[PDB]
Amino acid sequence: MKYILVTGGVISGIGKGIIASSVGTILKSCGLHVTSIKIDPYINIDAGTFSPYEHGEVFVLDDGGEVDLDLGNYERFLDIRLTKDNNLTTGKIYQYVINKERKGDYLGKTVQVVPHITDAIQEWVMRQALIPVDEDGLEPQVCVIELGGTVGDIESMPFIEAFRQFQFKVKRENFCNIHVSLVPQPSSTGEQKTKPTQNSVRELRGLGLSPDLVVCRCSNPLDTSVKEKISMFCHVEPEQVICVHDVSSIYRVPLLLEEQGVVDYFLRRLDLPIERQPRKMLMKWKEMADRYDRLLETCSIALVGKYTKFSDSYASVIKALEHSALAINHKLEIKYIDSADLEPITSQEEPVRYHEAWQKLCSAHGVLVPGGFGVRGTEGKIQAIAWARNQKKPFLGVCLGMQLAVVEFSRNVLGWQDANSTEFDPTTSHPVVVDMPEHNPGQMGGTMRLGKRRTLFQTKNSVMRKLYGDADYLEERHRHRFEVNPVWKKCLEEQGLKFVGQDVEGERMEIVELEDHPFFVGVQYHPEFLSRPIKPSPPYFGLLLASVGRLSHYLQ
Amino acid sequence: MKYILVTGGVISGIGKGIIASSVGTILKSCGLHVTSIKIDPYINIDAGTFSPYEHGEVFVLDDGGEVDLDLGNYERFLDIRLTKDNNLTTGKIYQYVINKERKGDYLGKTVQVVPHITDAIQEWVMRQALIPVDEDGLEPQVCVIELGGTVGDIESMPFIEAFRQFQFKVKRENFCNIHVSLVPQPSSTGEQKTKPTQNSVRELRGLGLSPDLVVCRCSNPLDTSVKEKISMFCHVEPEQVICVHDVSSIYRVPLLLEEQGVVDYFLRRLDLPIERQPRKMLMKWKEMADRYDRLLETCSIALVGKYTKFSDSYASVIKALEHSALAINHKLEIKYIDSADLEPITSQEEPVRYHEAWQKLCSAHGVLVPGGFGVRGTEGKIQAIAWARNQKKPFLGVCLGMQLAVVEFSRNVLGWQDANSTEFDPTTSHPVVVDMPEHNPGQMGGTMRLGKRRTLFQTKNSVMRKLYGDADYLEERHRHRFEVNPVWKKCLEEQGLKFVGQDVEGERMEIVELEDHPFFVGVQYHPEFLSRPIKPSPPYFGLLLASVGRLSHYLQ
Amino acid sequence: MKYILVTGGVISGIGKGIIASSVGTILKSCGLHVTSIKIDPYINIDAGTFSPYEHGEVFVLDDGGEVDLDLGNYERFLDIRLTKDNNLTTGKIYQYVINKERKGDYLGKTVQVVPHITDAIQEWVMRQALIPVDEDGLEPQVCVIELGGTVGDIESMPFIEAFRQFQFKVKRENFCNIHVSLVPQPSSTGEQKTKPTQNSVRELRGLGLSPDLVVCRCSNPLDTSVKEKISMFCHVEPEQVICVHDVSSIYRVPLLLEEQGVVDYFLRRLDLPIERQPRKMLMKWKEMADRYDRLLETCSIALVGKYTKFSDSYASVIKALEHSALAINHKLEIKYIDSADLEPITSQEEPVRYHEAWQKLCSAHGVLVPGGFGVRGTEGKIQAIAWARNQKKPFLGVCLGMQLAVVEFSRNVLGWQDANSTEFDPTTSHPVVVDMPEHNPGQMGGTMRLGKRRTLFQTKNSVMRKLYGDADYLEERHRHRFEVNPVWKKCLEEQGLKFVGQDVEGERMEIVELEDHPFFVGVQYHPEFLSRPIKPSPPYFGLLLASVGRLSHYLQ
Ligand SMILES: Nc1ccn([C@@H]2O[C@H](COP(=O)(O)OP(=O)(O)OP(=O)(O)O)[C@@H](O)[C@H]2O)c(=O)n1
Ligand SMILES: Nc1ccn([C@@H]2O[C@H](COP(=O)(O)OP(=O)(O)OP(=O)(O)O)[C@@H](O)[C@H]2O)c(=O)n1
Ligand SMILES: Nc1ccn([C@@H]2O[C@H](COP(=O)(O)OP(=O)(O)OP(=O)(O)O)[C@@H](O)[C@H]2O)c(=O)n1
Ligand SMILES: Nc1ccn([C@@H]2O[C@H](COP(=O)(O)OP(=O)(O)OP(=O)(O)O)[C@@H](O)[C@H]2O)c(=O)n1
Ligand SMILES: Nc1ccn([C@@H]2O[C@H](COP(=O)(O)OP(=O)(O)OP(=O)(O)O)[C@@H](O)[C@H]2O)c(=O)n1
Ligand SMILES: Nc1ccn([C@@H]2O[C@H](COP(=O)(O)OP(=O)(O)OP(=O)(O)O)[C@@H](O)[C@H]2O)c(=O)n1
Ligand SMILES: [Mg+2]
Ligand SMILES: [Mg+2]
Ligand SMILES: [Mg+2]
Ligand SMILES: [Mg+2]
Ligand SMILES: [Mg+2]
Ligand SMILES: [Mg+2]
């Protein structure tokens, strides 16, 4: 199998990820079945531990694996669904070698980093590369491997070494290496300076790998004499001296690499089954990018936050909204609102923030109410929901936004004001939302409803069923344990909120809609993770359709 | 607390261990309470997995820890008893950090090698340095840390980094570094060449440490101009350019370092409480070394082997015999004999080896019969035992040598030829030796009788009790699970073999002696691990006393 | 003697020069006698070869040495006059060692880079540091040494090695090292990234030096956590982690380093005779900087060029004008004009450039006409001179601008249109300007009038004599060989141009002025090289005085 290892030379920030994703995208566009693996030199075995602030979102796979948000990029650039094992980590590798020592798979020899850890890397890469990622059964042709960290770091050492050995195991006509490095230009001279590229590539071959492609970060398009200076250090022709100024969108990066002529070089080196064709389906992607730069019209809508500021806390959410907004042909505006200060105590005790938050909320012609854990802002988000309902604004509740949409309707519509969750308020008189973890054999204790599960539509009348394509059921990714209590469902039947989706077991109600309102729905799954730039996730699409006012027309 | 980190520059073979041990020995001789830690960059958490051929012997601590044979060196050079934690390993460090991540001790941050693994090293070193190793309660003054592997290796990277940071945590007046490197002389020119010292020390300060002492391996005593060339590269005066030609014994290495003047430099740098004294107890050690070079007289005696050749398979055993032989004022000769070819099948099928083995066994005026596991040679060693008994030769059975001494007496003396073990021959009609593992609360399944246990003498009449000092009981290190069955003890009472030692529980018989023979005993513990060069272990001493013929006189 | 070696870590562009100059300036401001040396790892022995375009201007010393423009910076920041030997170059060092080999100063030993080249560096640094640079006779207290190139480059290797050895020769309380490195912030995250500082300092101690100060380039003021991250890599407290965002002027850099507290650290490390004083004369420099940021009012004036664009071709010239303009309290505007296209052929053949040049020349309320060599634009600059004379605009002719001021007055005023130079037009019928090189004993052939020479005023009536302070003579730096022919001086006596300055020999006329004009003068020397920011050079001052219209008042 062919392999592309992507590494970084100077600093970690250089966006190795978008490079690797873009090379993958192009090879997919050439009709090749491409798989991708990411190495995260960190100790964490999985993503599950992460608090979303400091490292970001947690992504979820079809198999139920919690993984890095960087894997989600590979899933949105390539039409693929990853298994947990295409995230390789230091924690995973060391843990697996540790386990093999205990078993005695090592025959009572000493276990060393070399060869033993390095062999573990090579077995894993081979094994995972083989697994079919696309819908198609046949095995993949190329594997794009992205290695995190920078050459010279301690964390990366066992991986670079493994790849030094790997380049021999996989033949030369099968291995290739892309190195990304920085060509910094000081503001004064403006000269795109060469030195960091020189030293890092020296370091790399002192580790044992050598660049087959060189990727060159800048603020601006590159000089030829600069590329010729790079060429002179690094054995390489300027046409493999690929360069990347910062640009308007991630969607452009694969377009830029096509302009840079990378395909011809991979046909030349990797002997690829890309037969040469005058048209390839990339023309569609070119049209989409050309449409993206054109876009004009607005609608201010809110995302209801709990953290102090967006960094990565809503990354897939914002992308799902953006996919929808492009399909809608509108610019999204995301009005970030901390709800934890719209609540009464801080309404009095920081009144500047309180009026500011209401002024943002009065700009929203529609609201997204995403998920949550713990109690941070959990008494505040309820005001944006109630506002959307009473102001008749388009609404989508996601995970905890759905649990809060049930509680608020009980509090305000039913008159069941005593009603509350089990997360916050575990003392509650009438616990409307209760802990209900999944339990299975071979497992100890209750566990989170995590990963893809089938949710089945109760009735035909649903808007979500229509947006879904009038299919009988859907399969969507979950990550929770709190559910609406099944006993209390009865109180709802008389009134206008209705459960439209339920679990196959029947135990859990997973979608709700409010009648006599333009659009108002809540879901227990996380539709963001299933969104793709070619086709948005239907719930986000429905919200944006509704926010512009297109919804009624769309159904037609 | 003061710290001495000992590292290697060029190759691993340079005997960093004997250096570190010798520095420890000297500081102990100056009246300082010295502790020692060893870092083994290998993945193995503990020694227990090792098959003794490829990595050597397994050492046992007072706490029951299985550790490297290199820790045993620190225990014989310094009058100390180590806990398992003064062996630090990559496996131990990574495992402990992994566990802390699962607990959430990391507060949902990412866990990285730096700072997290590096902090784990620093907490461990501090914590262990504090624990009292000597009999005295008060904490140690200096900790000698030996780091395995060579600078520049991947395995050592997290430790060198930890020590770079550590040099700041512990003040300059508390940290010091010894670097050992090689001054190779080609046979032709004979010139003690400098280059490897130069590059490795460059590498070291590129890692962040700098030598405070430089230790210089050679075949021959060093030139001044060579030391001045080293000095010019490495910022250092020739008096810190310590050198080590290969020498006659390990016992000399601390003598050579005293000649090299190391004490004065540690007083100068580490501000040590060594008050200056004209005599220190090292004069005794000087006498012992001077006696060691004098020694003359022989006795050929056998060690009964199962492996094809000695490397390290009997290392503590041979040292125990040597301690005894020095106290006896005789040169030891160890006649290594593979018993697995004295048995009948190979007696016929490789007759050259069979006659060779008997010619060795006919040289033995006494025999040591050490322990064993599995079935390799287990039908052969029985012939050396029977030979010693019927030839009336001085004998010591150790672990499996004791189990075989019980079985043979049953087979030949009792006429219970049906008698056999449970290890080999699990089908046995009359299982004389049976699996009896120790069982305790908080443990799952049976486990090995491992570590120090108290064995109590049944009677006064014992030779071993006399060699022990007429004490009521002893405490000695075990590593087994097979014992003589307690039911079958009755058959013995009539005849000349007698059990002189038993467990406190009473469940297990742990020492045996045969009457009407010059010296013939077996033990379930491993007395080697308690031997020290100043005072041999009594069972080995008794064997050598008996082999020379001194025994009868010694008791007087 | 104390030494400060200044080196660079990441890239050459980081302005090591302004750092080194600024440290020098501060120590001078503390009353210390400071000398400075620069190492230029280039092969060129001297500056003389350089064509000013590609490497810049050529600077001239009092002794007649042609040196780099970077030495001129040390002369304008410190009130000092350098000898040729405080420029050390690879060419100079290798040449001197080569010469010593030929002499046999090496006693027939082999000559090697180490020790021999490295010793040559150490002798030179010691020797030069000792020479008095200030007017004062007593030797210097501190020597600031700037080393060009970046750590890790081949060119710098013999110098870093010399300094590794030198740190021992000069005691620790006498050597210190400043390392400058880059903390690049990408536009997206804005994070002031650490990695390049880490690697370069590792490289440096792998060369053998270690930073005593760390200087940190950025676009913006630094974060504390970033400095603490740097500190953790490089053994150093954040108060030695000095930082430098880009700023408005070079004059601010020493102010920023005072804010950064560098003085206290040099008192602490270098034990300096700075006695502690509450006021030091730096208050004047603070006032000057505060005045510099205030400045408002303009006058558009031209510099008449021959090259296509300013880079460094007029660097000291522009500084001299700027010193004058600050003393004048006006912003300078330098209108750069290529004269090589105001001439008739290109006036017709590139008419866009011709009209553009005249539009610039019509903006000029005064003109500077700097020097030249060869024939580039030599038929064009004559039009700006004639324009200034006939338009009655303030004028200064420098070197070739003076030779052209003589020729034009002959051509247009005298009617001696046949008159021309010997440089261009060597066929000339009446050679008004002729080659007259200086000749001396011990020299072969004629040579350039190069370096300081005394020019004596012919009469009292001169404006330049008044601007000079009514002194009898001046001493100014020359670099030429063409002079006005002495025979043709007679033609001038009747008319309004007059020679006011002449050589001591009497052979050469060196200053001219035109009567009945607001200000119009030419000089054979280069007054820029004598200008200082505290006191401008009088001819440039006179031009700016005249250009604003202040001149008449100034004399009062
Ligand atoms: N396939 C990808 C890759 C990146 N991104 C966007 O780019 C950012 C991350 O850029 P990346 O290419 O991962 O580089 P960095 O994360 O900046 O640095 P690294 O080189 O460590 O990846 C994310 O916010 C994400 O929205 C994306 O949308 N799709
Ligand atoms: N000698 C070192 C230093 C750091 N790291 C790794 O560096 C990673 C952080 O990457 P990056 O942000 O690129 O490094 P920083 O140290 O934060 O430097 P910068 O300020 O340039 O980000 C951490 O996971 C850590 O394990 C490493 O492997 N080896
Ligand atoms: N305190 C010590 C140290 C070493 N030895 C002897 O020396 C040998 C090991 O030498 P060592 O000092 O450990 O160096 P090497 O093992 O050769 O190499 P390294 O530097 O990795 O230790 C062992 O066979 C052991 O008998 C000893 O008796 N006592
Ligand atoms: N960093 C260094 C050190 C030394 N040399 C060169 O090393 C040569 C001497 O070679 P060799 O004898 O191999 O080195 P020694 O320093 O003498 O070391 P050794 O004791 O191993 O000979 C000299 O010409 C000197 O220029 C060098 O190029 N670079
Ligand atoms: N004492 C100084 C030093 C520098 N400069 C100005 O700064 C520029 C050069 O900056 P410098 O400090 O020499 O750094 P660079 O030349 O950019 O790079 P290097 O680090 O190689 O010097 C020159 O144009 C000069 O006008 C100055 O006026 N006075
Ligand atoms: N391995 C190398 C490469 C280059 N140089 C030196 O680098 C100097 C040029 O400095 P700089 O401009 O900093 O290097 P560039 O190669 O031009 O790189 P950049 O594009 O970053 O300027 C030259 O004098 C050359 O002798 C060196 O000493 N060693
Ligand atoms: Mg990434
Ligand atoms: Mg350059
Ligand atoms: Mg060892
Ligand atoms: Mg040599
Ligand atoms: Mg400079
Ligand atoms: Mg970082």
UniProtKB/Swiss-Prot annotation, chains A, B, C:
EC class (word): ligase
Family the UniProt entry places it in: Belongs to the CTP synthase family.
Primary role: This enzyme is involved in the de novo synthesis of CTP, a precursor of DNA, RNA and phospholipids. Catalyzes the ATP-dependent amination of UTP to CTP with either L-glutamine or ammonia as a source of nitrogen. This enzyme and its product, CTP, play a crucial role in the proliferation of activated lymphocytes and therefore in immunity.
Tissues with expression: Widely expressed.
UniProt note on regulation of activity: Activated by GTP and inhibited by CTP.
Protein name: CTP synthase 1
Residue intervals of the Glutamine amidotransferase type-1 domain: 300-554
Keyword annotations: Acetylation, ATP-binding, Cytoplasm, Glutamine amidotransferase, Immunity, Ligase, Nucleotide-binding, Phosphoprotein, Pyrimidine biosynthesis
Catalysed reaction, written as an equation: UTP + L-glutamine + ATP + H2O = CTP + L-glutamate + ADP + phosphate + 2 H(+)
